[PDB]
């Protein structure tokens, strides 16, 4: 997953937000499972 | 009555003023102002490719 070679990352959006960030995470998409209510899934 | 305040803060500015178009000049020796960049000097076409 993490290939070879060169591939230059391009710009996608600058924002002016101007706060103060130390910590992330990440958002994944879940599907109900009408049937455990959400479809298992990985990522 | 409408009330307009303004105020300033340390984040950017972004409320701000028209700004002109005015026109282009090509082929002269012109005093050019190209997004808060200034200078002096003739505006050719150009082939480079950005
Ligand atoms: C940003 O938040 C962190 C954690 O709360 C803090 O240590 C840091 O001083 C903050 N930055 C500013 C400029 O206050």
Same mark, same amino acid.
């Given at each position: @997953?993490?290939?070879? $070679?060169?591939? /230059?990352?391009?710009?996608?959006? @600058?924002?002016?937000? $101007?706060?103060?960030?130390?910590?992330?995470?990440?958002?994944? /998409?879940?599907?109900?499972?009408?049937?455990? $209510?959400?479809? /298992? $899934?990985?990522? | 009555?409408?009330?307009?305040? #303004?105020?300033?803060?340390?984040?950017?500015?972004?409320?701000?003023?028209?700004?002109?178009?005015?026109?282009?000049?090509?082929?002269?020796?012109?005093?050019?102002? #190209?997004?808060?960049?200034?200078? !002096?000097?003739?505006? !050719?076409?150009?082939?480079?490719?950005?």
């Amino acid at each position: @997953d993490l290939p070879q $070679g060169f591939s /230059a990352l391009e710009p996608l959006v @600058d924002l002016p937000i $101007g706060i103060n960030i130390t910590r992330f995470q990440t958002l994944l /998409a879940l599907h109900r499972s009408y049937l455990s $209510g959400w479809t /298992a $899934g990985a990522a | 009555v409408v009330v307009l305040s #303004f105020e300033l803060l340390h984040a950017p500015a972004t409320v701000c003023g028209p700004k002109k178009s005015t026109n282009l000049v090509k082929n002269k020796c012109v005093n050019f102002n #190209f997004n808060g960049l200034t200078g !002096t000097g003739v505006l !050719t076409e150009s082939n480079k490719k950005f």
